[PDB]
Structure 1
Amino acid sequence: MTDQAFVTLTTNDAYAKGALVLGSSLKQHRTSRRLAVLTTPQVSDTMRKALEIVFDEVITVDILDSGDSAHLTLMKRPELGVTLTKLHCWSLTQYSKCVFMDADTLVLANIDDLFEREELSAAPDPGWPDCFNSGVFVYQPSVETYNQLLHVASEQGSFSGGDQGLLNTFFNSWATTDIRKHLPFIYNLSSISIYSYLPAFKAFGANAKVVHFLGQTKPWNYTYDTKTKSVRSPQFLNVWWDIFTTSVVPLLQQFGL
């Protein structure tokens, strides 16, 4: 309850919109857990203030600062900035277990049953199914684990150039051990797989609990007609935008005054 939480990350204003929509969807589906968001100084004060309303806790992380434990690793591998910031989710020891969710995900149903899982539980990644997608995962905050992950990032880095390669390298028993750590694909449904693999989606896609907006074009990069309630050339994108239009935009207007 109080010691369990959903955790996300925003490094800029664009992703803050996603985090705001994500946090709003979790509230909409009545989660009994806390909502936390990791933010960087590059996130504007207005976005930060909106995050303070949606989330129960807003944690500031600045790996560009010499006083950060990951700063030194950043100097060694500067392309891992976002990955190193994300790794700070393991530093949230005020929580006993968390579900990390990237800011480009969207909750369509209550997913509190994920807290029944153990670290590290995650859904299979499309493309290379023997690796888990790092967009949604159940983990246990721990300083020791954080230090071990930083160590791997420093010595080996990431084979994907992002957090997914590093996480799969560290939690390498996932593919061959414990089927319970394989979260069903509906808990992290790739937007690509939906519009791409039609037959499979038509058969199981109605059970989708979480949609992960992948690819270059993010939800906030689309144009949304407020009258017809649809994006321009989409059900999931329309849900994202309905929440953004209904709950997020008017919230951001509260500060103009």
Structure 2
Amino acid sequence: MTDQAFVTLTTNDAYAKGALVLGSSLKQHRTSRRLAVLTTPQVSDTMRKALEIVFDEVITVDILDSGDSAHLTLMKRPELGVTLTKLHCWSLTQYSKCVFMDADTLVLANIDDLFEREELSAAPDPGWPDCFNSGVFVYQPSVETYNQLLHVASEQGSFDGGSQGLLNTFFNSWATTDIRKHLPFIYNLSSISIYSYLPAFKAFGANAKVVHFLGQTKPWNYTYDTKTKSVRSMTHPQFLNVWWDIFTTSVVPLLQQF
């Protein structure tokens, strides 16, 4: 309850919008857990203040600062900035168990049952199913694990340049061990898989609990008509329209309070 949380991340104002929508969707579906978001100094004061209303806790991380434990590793592998910031999710020892969620995800139903899972639990990644998608995962905050993850980042880096490669390398038993650590795909439904593998989507898509907007084009990169309540041209904009309805209804007016 108080010791468990959903954790997201935002390094800029664009992803902050995503974080704000994600946070609102979690409250909308009455989560009994806390909401935390990792932010960087590059996030504007207005976005930061909005996040302070939506989330129960707003933590500030600055790996660009020499005082940060990940900085040394950043100098060695500068292309891993976002990934190194994301790893600080393991530094939140005020929580016994958390569910990390990318700022570009959207909750469509209560997913508190994820807290029954153990580290490391995640849904399979489309494209290479033997790797889990790092957009949504169940983990347990720990300084030891964090240090172990930093060590691997320093020595090996990430085979994909992001957090997915690093996490899959460290939590390498995922593909062959414990089916319970394989989160059902509907807990991290790739938006690409939706408009593509149409048959499978038509069959199981209605059970979606979380949508992950993976492409280059994020939800905030579209134009939304408030009158027709739909984005402008995608055979399935329904999810983009939900994202935008929350943004229009709860997020935008909240940003006007400042």
Class of the TM-score when normalised by the shorter of the 2 chains: over 0.9
**TM-aligned CA deviation for residue 11 of structure 1:** 0.3
For 1:197 and 1:250, the matched residues in 2 are separated by: 36
For 1:228 and 1:145, the matched residues in 2 are separated by: 48
TM-score, normalisation: structure 2:
0.99
For 2:71 and 2:167, the matched residues in 1 are separated by: 19
Give 5+ residue unaligned stretches, structure 2: none
Q: CA RMSD in A?
A: 0.1
CA deviations 1:28-75 (Å, max 9, x no partner) are 000000000000000000000000000000000000000000000000
CA deviations 1:128-151 (Å, max 9, x no partner) are 000000000000000000000000
For 2:181 and 2:219, the matched residues in 1 are separated by: 29
**TM-aligned CA deviation for residue 170 of structure 1:** 0.1
Please name the residue that 2:257 is paired with.
254
**TM-aligned CA deviation for residue 168 of structure 1:** 0.0
> How do residues 1-257 of structure 1 correspond to structure 2 at under 5 angstroms?
1-233=1-233, 234-255=237-258
For 1:65 and 1:124, the matched residues in 2 are separated by: 35
CA deviations 1:74-94 (Å, max 9, x no partner) are 000000000000000000000
Q: Secondary structure at the match of 1:211?
A: strand
**TM-aligned CA deviation for residue 98 of structure 1:** 0.1
CA deviations 1:88-124 (Å, max 9, x no partner) are 0000000000000000000000000000000000000
Q: Secondary structure at the match of 1:5?
A: strand
Q: How many residues align?
A: 255
For 1:179 and 1:53, the matched residues in 2 are separated by: 37
Give 5+ residue unaligned stretches, structure 1: none
Instruction: Give 4+ residue runs of structure 1 displaced > 2 Å after superposition.
Output: none
TM-score, normalisation: structure 1:
0.99
**TM-aligned CA deviation for residue 191 of structure 1:** 0.1
**TM-aligned CA deviation for residue 220 of structure 1:** 0.2
**TM-aligned CA deviation for residue 179 of structure 1:** 0.1
